Write a protein that binds this ligand. Sequence first.
Ligand code: HEM
Ligand code: HEM
Ligand code: HEM
Ligand code: HEM
Lengths: 146, 146, 141, 141
Amino acid sequence: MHLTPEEKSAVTALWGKVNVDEVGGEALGRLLVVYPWTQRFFESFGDLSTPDAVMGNPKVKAHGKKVLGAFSDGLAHLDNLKGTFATLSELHADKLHVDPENFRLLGNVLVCVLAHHFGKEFTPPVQAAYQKVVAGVANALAHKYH
Amino acid sequence: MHLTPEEKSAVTALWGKVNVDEVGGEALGRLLVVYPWTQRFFESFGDLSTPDAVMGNPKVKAHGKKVLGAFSDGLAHLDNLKGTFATLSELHADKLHVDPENFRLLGNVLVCVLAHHFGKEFTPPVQAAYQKVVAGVANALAHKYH
Amino acid sequence: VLSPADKTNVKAAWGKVGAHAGEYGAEALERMFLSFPTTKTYFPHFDLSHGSAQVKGHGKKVADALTNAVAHVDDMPNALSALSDLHAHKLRVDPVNFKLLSHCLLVTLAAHLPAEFTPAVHASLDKFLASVSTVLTSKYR
Amino acid sequence: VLSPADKTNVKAAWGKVGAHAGEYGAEALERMFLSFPTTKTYFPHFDLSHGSAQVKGHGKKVADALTNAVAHVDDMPNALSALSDLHAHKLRVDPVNFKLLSHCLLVTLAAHLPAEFTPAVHASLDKFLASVSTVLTSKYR
Ligand code: HEM
Ligand code: HEM
Ligand code: HEM
Ligand code: HEM
């Protein structure tokens, strides 16, 4: 990445305090609620008719955990997101047909969830490093689209 | 910059036919006319009140030629746009304070100008090559913003 | 908002399109597929090969809708309601893609109407496609 | 289009902001400047250093206008005529930037109003900032 040692340590350090289970479920669910059109890929999950039905849906929660999982592992290859997400990039393009713009919506949602959770701790400089990471991830994931 | 050899040959073959003086004036004038907000940088250019006043303005024509001149040089270093555009990136950032979104708007207008001029010769695949190029140049011009 | 001048410009340029609308619709699509490959994610079910009949078929449908908005330039929200519903509720195309298609339609018109694609007309056509896109995305949330 | 629930959600949330809106305005700007440095191109005449009075001052101005917007949630176009003007004809901020400030504002509210920043409220505030953005760029061309 174009992360500063200082920026790397901030990311890394906050991440250590994250409950992926909870943040993953919350991030995906907020996505389906704020940008309703993203529900087009999760019809099989059930009733997403209300915030409550989205936020409560176990399938949503479990997919959320899978996604943040993968994200989390990507934080360990911050100097080669491209190579870490190559296979995932192909899958998303060729099997799932997910428009990469969704990657960017989620990223922003993720940042709002971290701010929500960490209040004070999520300072302007810390948000700045996370914005760089979410953009980085989105780019990596979109890399194999053709 | 994922220009396949064939994409690069295509960019170069067409660029051979361009009258940079002319294209430059047209591209810049059209930018000022389609997205009038971009006129914020040129209050010393005089009358930009109507399409004719913009398109025929001797200062817009001269500036367009300058801009496209730097762009043409860029096309001879497709390999190293970042290096090629570094001092210009700094200037636009630090002295001129030009929001980089302006570089993407001009790229789109330029594509329409090439289409206008070349007609049928500006095929779907040639456009796709030029789309990669204007994006690469916009990106190089924005690399020094901080 | 479209000014009287804008309206005149659009009816005029679109006027020239006439009977080639369908073909220009298809071409705009192909340009879009080639320049912005991410847009292909919405047509996994299509044959996107060159001269694809599905693309031909689709280009006509898009062109018909544009022709319909031109015909009803003073009541676009109502003339396009149905299409606005479809996009918001069924297709659920991310909004950013409208700008991509718009752009490719503008390239297409430019490539075919050299005498009409004046700076003034270019500007009016861009405001028009932006307005169509706005209508089509109005019921998203 | 803001639904009645949305207007309620917004009024509630902003209600809790209270005497801190100015500080939240200033914080959102600071977050914007650091996260999206291209936004700084519009403030060459400001001291963008942390705790700068110019930034604080401006933060208040923005916050205040949002307040006024919440208050006239039913008549935004009218409540913000002047501001729409200023931005369209004087400032000429590129439209892409409005989305950046809007995002920095959500992030700020989220970090300060935990209990209140529910998923439904998050959705409403987003729509709201979107509408405000639309209003502010409606006279651009
Ligand atoms: C942070 C970015 C993302 C990461 C790291 C990520 C990662 C993953 C992973 C690891 C899987 C597991 C599938 C498998 O291995 O077979 C998956 C599946 C999937 N993802 Fe992504 N994803 C991301 C963003 C998104 C977004 C934003 C959407 C749509 C809004 C999406 C839609 C899907 C769908 C529909 C599946 C298939 C799940 C199933 O089989 O039911 N992904 N993703
Ligand atoms: C392909 C993108 C561009 C290139 C290659 C380019 C190149 C140049 C060059 C070579 C100069 C003269 C440098 C000097 O004075 O030392 C210049 C100046 C300038 N450029 Fe850019 N430019 C580009 C895009 C833009 C755009 C899109 C805008 C505004 C919308 C812009 C705004 C300016 C301004 C305001 C000046 C100074 C004019 C003056 O002398 O008062 N540039 N540019
Ligand atoms: C101004 C822009 C647009 C117009 C006028 C337009 C119009 C239409 C029309 C008339 C149809 C056919 C509905 C029917 O079956 O009667 C359609 C379908 C569709 N559109 Fe849009 N559309 C626009 C933008 C987009 C964009 C930007 C995308 C995605 C990149 C898109 C994706 C689709 C898809 C996937 C379908 C369904 C096609 C099928 O399965 O046959 N549309 N559109
Ligand atoms: C959420 C939407 C926004 C609102 C409600 C808003 C509101 C305002 C207000 C109330 C003023 C002060 C008017 C005065 O000085 O009397 C202002 C000025 C200004 N705004 Fe906007 N603004 C918004 C978005 C933006 C964005 C995104 C930017 C640029 C990134 C921007 C750039 C400016 C600038 C440069 C000034 C003048 C600063 C000065 O010289 O004091 N605005 N805006």
